[PDB]
Amino acid sequence: LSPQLEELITKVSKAHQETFPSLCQLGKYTTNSSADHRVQLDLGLWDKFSELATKCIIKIVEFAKRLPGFTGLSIADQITLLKAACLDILMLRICTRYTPEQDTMTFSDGLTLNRTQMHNAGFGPLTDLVFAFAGQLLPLEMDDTETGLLSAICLICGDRMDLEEPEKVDKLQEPLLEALRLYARRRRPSQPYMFPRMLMKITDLRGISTKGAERAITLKMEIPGPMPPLIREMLEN
Numbered sequence: 001l002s003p004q005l006e007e008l009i010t011k012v013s014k015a016h017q018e019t020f021p022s023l024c025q026l027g028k029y030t031t032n033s034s035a036d037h038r039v040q041l042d043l044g045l046w047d048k049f050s051e052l053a054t055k056c057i058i059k060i061v062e063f064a065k066r067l068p069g070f071t072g073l074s075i076a077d078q079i080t081l082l083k084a085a086c087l088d089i090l091m092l093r094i095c096t097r098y099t100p101e102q103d104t105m106t107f108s109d110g111l112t113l114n115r116t117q118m119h120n121a122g123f124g125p126l127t128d129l130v131f132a133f134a135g136q137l138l139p140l141e142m143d144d145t146e147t148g149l150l151s152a153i154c155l156i157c158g159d160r161m162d163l164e165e166p167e168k169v170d171k172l173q174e175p176l177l178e179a180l181r182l183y184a185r186r187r188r189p190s191q192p193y194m195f196p197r198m199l200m201k202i203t204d205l206r207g208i209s210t211k212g213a214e215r216a217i218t219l220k221m222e223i224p225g226p227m228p229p230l231i232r233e234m235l236e237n
């Protein structure tokens, strides 16, 4: 029935808005750490960054638990899905927080870092790609509910590796794909290419993620002391 899809659109949307505050509703603030020029790594900036990344991972898990059906999956699958799609969601999240005019990216507590600071915070040689990915996301003018659905689709993925019940995860994903097409087309009937442009983004996203995992390999050498435990859980993929 249609009322069940509208119900799913509503739940996913609320689940996202509650685990991911919008840019416009955020109390933006700045820091003066290494804003001047690019350096290998500003450690004070990386502590605050890892701290925020860990908080986001928890918010991602929180969001995943509110997605209809996820909890019914085996606990092994739930972990497997999160493990595989966490960086992807993480990348999509910070990218929806791009303010093109100031050329900054805002975090959930309001920390607003300019490109130089993002670089010095840990992004390193991947900074510019991330920023270019966020740029090219702007033209799609997605909203909170579309980002939420898109994020769910990245998560509920049957093609993952150690799934015990891949066939069940595929069925869970089915309505999210219907839900997103129904929603995207209704909001904007004049641009029928939004849905397929959104799905194709999942591929782009997945790519900026493998580069991000790759960047975490290097970073581990540059930082004094082990990377946070939840961040490490995610990278063990």
Ligand SMILES: CC1(C)CCC(C)(C)c2cc([C@H](O)C(=O)Nc3ccc(C(=O)O)cc3F)ccc21
Pocket (backbone or CB within 6 Å): 049, 050, 052, 053, 054, 055, 056, 090, 091, 093, 094, 106, 107, 108, 109, 122, 123, 124, 126, 211, 212, 213, 215, 216, 219, 231
């Ligand atoms: C694996 C690890 C720790 C090292 C490699 C790089 C620097 C590439 C990276 C990049 C990201 C991600 O792109 C991001 O910043 N997401 C992000 C999104 C939202 C918030 C928030 O709203 O608070 C915080 C974030 F952290 C996350 C992890 C990592």
